[model samples]
Structures are given as C-alpha cells and as structure tokens.
Target: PITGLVYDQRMMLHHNMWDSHHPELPQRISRIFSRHEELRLLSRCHRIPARLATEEELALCHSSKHISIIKSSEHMKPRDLNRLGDEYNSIFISNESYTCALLAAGSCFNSAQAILTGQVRNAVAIVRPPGHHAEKDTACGFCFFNTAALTARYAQSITRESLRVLIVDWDVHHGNGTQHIFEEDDSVLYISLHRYEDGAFFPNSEDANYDKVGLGKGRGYNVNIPWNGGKMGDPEYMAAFHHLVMPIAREFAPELVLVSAGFDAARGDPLGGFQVTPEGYAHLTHQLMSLAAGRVLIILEGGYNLTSISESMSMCTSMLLGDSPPSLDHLTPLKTSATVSINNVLRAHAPFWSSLR
Candidate 1:
C-alpha cells in the first residue's frame, strides 16, 4: 500500500446539474460522493487544497484554438451552444459549468503534481465534468476537458524527457477522447477495455479490432481489448494484464501511470452489461499499482450504481494501501461459461507481441 494520498475538496463543486433530467447522471454523482464521504469518515483523510489551471497550463494538451472556442462559447446564444454536440445534452451554461470545469482541471493538475513532487505516493481525484471523452477541439460524453490527457502532458513537460505515460481506462464506455489525444504519440500509451456493443453506443467506431495500432511514430501504442455482451471477471481482466498490458508496459517502461478509474464497469452499473465484480476491480488496481512502482493517480470517470461503486472503491483503497481487500467469497463468479474469453483475446493479439517488445 502507498503511504500517502492527496485530493482537493473543491472537486465536488463540479456537480452534474444535468442529473435533473438524466436519472443515471444523478445516481452516478451521488454514488461517487457518498463513497468519498464514507472513506473520509473511515480514514479521517484530509482534503488537499487546489486552484484552477491557467490558460497556459490548459494549452499544454489542448490547442489554443480549442481553448479559445470553449471560452468564447461560454456565453454564446442558446442556438449557437446547441451546435457543440449531443453529449452536452442541452447543457446550457451558467457561470457554474465554467467554474466547475476550471476547478476540476486544477484538482487533477494538483494531484499529478503531488505524485511527481513526492508529496504523495498515490492519489485520487474525485472531480466532475468527467474528462475521458473530451477531444482536443470538441467536447463529448459529458466531458469538457481531457483531464487525464492534460495531466500526462504536464508530467512529460515536468520531466523534460520522453517520459512514457500509461493511461488505463476501465470505464464502461470507450474513452474516445483520451484515445484521440494520444493516438499519434509514442511517449504515451493508451489502453482501454470497454463494452463494445457493436457500435450501438455513442462515438461508435470501427470494429473493436486490435489492429487499430496508432499512426506513424505511434504504431502499436494504442491498444483496445473490447469486450462484448458476456462475463468479464477478475481472471479474465488479469489475463489481459499478464498477456497484453504487463508485457507491453514493461517494454515501454513508463515514468508515471494515470488511471481513468471509472466504477461504471462494476457488475451493477446500469450503463454496463459485463459482470466485473468489486473484487475484480480491486485486483486490477493492485496490478496497476504494482507495475507503476506505487506511482499512480486515479481520477474518477463513471460509475452509477451506488452500492457497487462504494464497495469497489473501498476494495481498491484497501488493496492499494497494502491491506487485504474485503472478501468476495460470498458472491458468485459472473463468468459461468465465458472462461476462454481471455485465451481468445491472447490468440487474436499474438502478432503484436514482437512489435510491443
């Protein structure tokens, strides 16, 4: 377990007002915050102070043009705002959205700085306006800025080296924005395993193929192990790490690791169909922490089911702290017949091993 953790309290200010209409959004936010309060009660953890990122800091990952557009659009007429995209979901801006996004982005930046500066060995940012889906020039999937991408980019700049950064997204939905930001960069490797519902979901892409290895200079840097409508338990996800993530990550030798730690993939999340239990998420967190030398920054993304989210977070905190996770002996394993799914994934991606190494 890591010895230190840091997080800013200002993060809660970025609430999902859209929750008034969307039942899922409200539940997701409520679950996350409720668990956060519970953890505080259990551990007496202190909330770190944070500030908003300057335009220059944001420009590290976002284009100047993109930044300008968002700023300009903040007070645009209702009709003009509608053109942004559907994910915004008619989210009209008051002053709160802008304020919340700034604070959320700043909290992420502060958490990354804490890890890099040795102030904390491990930290988690429970901020809102979830960012994994925001692109360089466009906002989608309820994300206004790519917080994970910005943190990684900041880390690289601080180190002043080709600092390899690994972004692991476990959200139920594909982190299309995060993938887009780092798609053509070799210094950062983006890996996401999401429920691929045959393009029925938003930002639908081409077939969930392994050959989507990025473009020039970044070939083999992007990996997507898409899961279909079936069970994905601890063993299956672990197999992905053993065969794909562990081997490839060792080859890349990253300086830091960032996790788009969304609990939406928990067994009970309505948005997710897979059967990944709390213990499975704990095991995944354990493996990632082990690989990264206990240097990891986890930022909340999506998880709607309250009970599952709270339990899963507690399990993760325990494991990361080097304590035994809560026992899962009572729950039945979700994968009754999908035992060979891992083997199938391994066989399909065998050709990429040489390149990864």
Candidate 2:
C-alpha cells in the first residue's frame, strides 16, 4: 500500500531567470510539498530520488535534433536563451532549465518504475517545467520534454508485454504534444479535458476540437473533452467522468494509468477560468484509482495559481495515499457548455468505442 513521492530541489532552479511575474514559479512545488507536510501526507509515503534521464531514454519520444537543441541551452547566454525561447510558443529558458527538464523527465520515469515493479502501489511526481505540451521536435507551451509520453513509451518497453497505458490530462489547455505523440498508436490512450474556446486558446489549433479523436489505428483511443467557454465546476467534470470518461476507460481496461494532473482549471487561476475545487480533483482521482489495480501515477503538468494548485495537488495526493474522498456538497446541474462538450465527445468517439455506442 505504499504511495511513492518524487521531488527535487534542483527543479526549483529551472525558473524564468528574468521574469518575476511568470506563473510557473519555483514555489509551485515548494508550496505543494509544504501543504503535504502540513497535512502529514508526506510521512506516510516513500520518497523516491530523482535522477537525470539519459539521452537515449529521452530519444524515446523526442527527436535527436530536439534533444541536441535542449542540451545546447545549458550554458547559453540570456540573449541566446531568449532567441531559443522565441522559436517555441509560450516557453522560457534559463541556464538550469535543461538540467531541471531532465530531472523532471527522470523523476516521472522513476515513478512509473516504482508502480510497475510493485515498489509502490502508486505514485505522484511533483515536478516543474510541465511536459504535456511538448512535441517530438519542438518545445511548446512551457514544456521542453514530453515527460508523460516518454513515461508511457518506457512503461510499454519494460513490461512483460506491451503495456496498455491511459493518460488523463485535466489541464486547462490541451496537451497537443502528448496527443500528437500517440495520435497513431492505440496502446497509449490519451484523454484530455481542456478549454478549446473554438481554437482561441493557447496553441490555438483546430485539432484541439472534439472531432480530432485519433488517426488510423489510434482511432477513438484519443479523447478530448473540450469545454467551449465559461467557468466549469465539480458537477460538470463529474458528469463528464460518469458519462464519457469512465464508460470508455472501462472498455479500454488499461494496464496502467498516468494522469497529466494539472491544476490550472482550479477556481481563481488567472489563466484557467474554471471553478473546480480541490475536493473536485480528489473525487476525480478516486474514480481513476479503481482502474489499473490502483496503479495510478499523477504527474504534475500545469497550474498557475499557487494556492489553488498546491491545495489541488495535496487533495489528489491524499486520495493516492488511501484517503476517502470527501463528498461534494450542494451539487449543481452540469453547465450547458459542459453538456454540449460531453455530447460532442460521445458522438465523435461513438464510431470507435463500443462502450460509447
């Protein structure tokens, strides 16, 4: 029943060395760890040491040139770093960004190993420089390395047979990188609930819409529950789970589950205008725990508000630590946007998944 925890102070060094107002601050992980300490959740879990991911391991999901580009940024000057950042969308880099990115990727890999090898029942990697938005050849949306994608690929490589993996991304923005990485592969089912706003959101690609399920063999394996607009709360998220997420997930019967856990959708986040509370996240985590024999690895992705993300992180971790999720009181009906989005998802994937049909 051991729940593994992964964190490193070195990740704190990989922040915007110039911008003080950036939302992805070093305190994001610190505050989350402190919250766990306050709740005494840290004492109940096994702390796993983070290591550097070898270049070969990183090549699992990233291109060789992309890996070389990131490696070259280690000792670059501020002007050179800024020039590199300009090539990607919504990204920043410091001297230690490359080191921190490697640590984040390795930490997630270690967490997956811990779960698959039965070293721990499940794990949560509180990492920075979130990776869902990164692509095979380019870094996008504050992500350098596709951490979750590499983890899924590594899990399949190390398992006895090809391990069927499910990735649930609840970040406010779509994980275009992760989706693209597994778009044609059926083994790793990618499910993301994010704000589309009709391709007006960050990355702002039309592919983020509900209709882009998956290509070729990966058809229906990719699920995008894109909220059109407005603030979405607990009821809306729960409805999506009960109606869309769970039905198809049960059919898929994944061998392992990796949640690209992002708290940007929490209420009061400057970026994600949604209203989901920490308890809402806890209930969501509990539902996923029933799958993969409780082998769920919740890796940190994106969240701007420190208080909201930290609280959300702690709540989800407590659920991973075997706490019964508290009941959501004063439940409300699903929002019209949420309902429309859920229906769109159901209709889009109906042709592929029997459970939805």
Candidate 3:
C-alpha cells in the first residue's frame, strides 16, 4: 500500500517559471490530478493533507542567504519583476511562487515521514515548480528549491541512526543541482540518467559528464549516465538498470529510495523526445520498490508533456498500489549504442564500486 500527497489548492497559484510562453504551468499539476481523479487513483492512496515547509526546514538544503532572496520575491516591485524575471535562471516570482515552493518542499518532507514511519509502503509527492534543477544558491530550470535533496537530509534527522539515501533521477535533463548538493556527502548516492548532448542541454555544466564522479570522501557517490541522443525506450533504460544502476544500488542497500520522478522521457513529450511509455515507467518503479524494504519516496521533477506525464505517473501510482504492471513487449531489441552507454558508465565507476566487478 502507498500514501499520496496533494496540495491544499494553493499550489495551483504558482506558475510562469520563465514567461507566459513557457510550458511550466500550474496546469501541469491539475492535469495530472484530473487524470488521477478520473482513474480513481487517489481513492486507493492514503492521501496526506498538504502542508507548507518552514524556513528552517528549507534551510536543510538551501543557504539562509538564498532562502532570504526567494522569500522576498513576493514583495518585489513590478518594474523589478520585469527586469529580474530574466535573471533568476528560469524561476519567476509571482506572489504565489514562494508559497507554492514551500508547499512543494513540505510535501516531499511529509511523504518521506510517511514511508520512514511505516505509514505507507511507498509514496509520491506530486509537486509543481519541480526542484531538481534548483541549486543551493541559485534557482533555475523551472525549479526553486531542491525538494528531494532537502527531503534526503531531513529524513536522516528523523531517524535514530544514520540512514543512507539513494536518489535516482530519470528526468530527461540532468539533476545538476541535486547532484551538486550531495556530491561531497558519502551518505547519499545520486544517480542521474539524462541527455547531455555534450553539454548542449539546459543547465549546461561540465558536471554532467561521467568522469566527474564525486569529490573527497564521496568519490563514486555521484553517477552520471549521459545519453548522447534521444529515442531511448524501455530496452535501453532497463539495460542500464540491470548493468549499472541496479547493481550499485543493491550493493549500497539504502534505507530509503528517492526518485526524481520526471516523465518528460515518456513518449510524446516534446522536450524529452524519448520513446519511454507509461508501462516503462511502471516497470522502473516496480524494480526500485524492491529496495529499502519498499520505502520509496518519489518526488515530482521535470515533465513537460502533460498527457505523457499524467499517464506515466498514473501507471507508477498504480504499481505502488500492489497492482501488477502491464508487461512491456520484449520484441524490440536493445540498441548497441544503449549497451555501450551503460558500459561506459559502468567502466567509469567500476573502480569505486565492487558491485561492478
């Protein structure tokens, strides 16, 4: 059984990450919610009432100076809003943006609480203004706060002993901010599978490369599988899982698994341009559920295709409800390039993880 988290209607007020022409909208959440309602998904979930994350709670991942800048967004003058809208990377501060971000961060924290305390077997925090792209000092890529990062640190505080956290980011774009936040912390292992295109993508940074591993004591804790091109479907993704991700994760044996659940890679997503289907997302979620005694917390990340995201997430939530997923057709052979991609990542980190040997 899984518990679900939904906002208190105030989340609908946050939007326009860049400008009126952008795809990140409040409609994103409502569209998914409408589908969830139509499919009666929430009825099966132990829905947690939405709550706002406090300033101190947010400080778990972001600096107080950064928090102060975001907190003061609501009070900026209109002229200032216009001049600075283009400055904060992609984050736009409407009077409602900060409040909405607080709600998103809070949702992730509570969802983790639910799983750690055994209130639910697994859960999803369907939040908007996705957080994976937001770094500690900077806000970008349609995100403001690092929700999963904050949740990971806060989850450790909730337990008596230290709890290792494994953050799996399958968003079409690299989770640069989440990776940045935890790259030096050996307790958290962050893995991201994204389209790098040789640093031509959004949030373009050298850190997206596989060789950039972790620093200091966290050497091998950071894993990056940069996809050279798109059209990567179930076969390629699953192959990567079997060859690299699953092996290292099982060896790590984290107490909790956090998925940066982004559906942009699903079929029909204009931005993601991948061939993954809803069934693909279901299987991925299914395999991940085997970890941490089924303590998995999926915090919503990037997914622009409304229909694709909603359908993919719908299947994932259904899987958490103990429903068997529709089997994926194995007729399509795995691409050699996909296998090579997985091999490349494994060879890079094989030196750090004995699981690869």
Which candidate should be chosen as best, given lDDT against the real structure?
Answer: 2
C-alpha lDDT of candidate 2 relative to the true structure: 0.91
RMSD (Å) per prediction: 3.6, 1.1, 1.6
From the highest lDDT down, the ranking of the candidates is 2, 3, 1
Q: How would you encode candidate 1's per-residue C-alpha lDDT over 207-313 as one tens digit per residue? A: 34455667777777788776655756565566667677777777777778888988887887777756678788877787787766778777777777778877776
lDDT of 3 by residue, 195-291 (tens): 7777887767878988878999999999998887556988888877878889999998999999999998889888888888899999999989898
Over 4 Å off, model 3: 329-331
Q: Model 2: residues >4 Å from true position, as ranges?
A: 329-331
What is the C-alpha lDDT profile of model 2 across 259-329, one tens digit per residue?
Answer: 99999999989989889999999999999999989999999999989989989999999999988787875
Task: In angstroms, give how far residue 163 of model 1 lies from its true place.
Answer: 0.8
Q: What does the lDDT come to for candidate 1?
A: 0.68
Q: Please, what's the RMSD in Å of model 2?
A: 1.1
